[PDB]
Structure 1
Amino acid sequence: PTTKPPTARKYIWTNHKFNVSGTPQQYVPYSTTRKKIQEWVPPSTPY
């Protein structure tokens, strides 16, 4: 890469990180979609 530098993109990390498994910076999977069905909010006023 000293001779042929990699193409420079703004989205490319400026700090490479090693395998962070077993450390607090490890990757924890989760759902990325929002809640599908919305529950009905009961009224706050009495009858």
Structure 2
Amino acid sequence: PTVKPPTARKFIWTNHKFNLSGTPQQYVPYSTTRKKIQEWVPPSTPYK
């Protein structure tokens, strides 16, 4: 890379990270979608 450097993009990380497994920086998987079914919220007034 000193002779043929890589192309620069803005989004490319400026600081490489090594394997973080087993540390507080590890990756925890999670669902990235939002809630599908919205639940009716009962009225907060005393009715009758």
TM normalised by structure 2 equals 0.95
**Runs of at least 4 residues off by over 3 Å:** none
Per-residue deviation, 1:16: 0.3
Q: SS at 1:41's partner residue?
A: coil
Return the offset for 1:35: 0.4
1:25 aligns with 2:25: yes
How many residues align structurally? 47
Give the TM-score normalised by structure 1.
Answer: 0.97
Q: Which runs of 5+ in 1 are unaligned?
A: none
RMSD value, Cα: 0.4
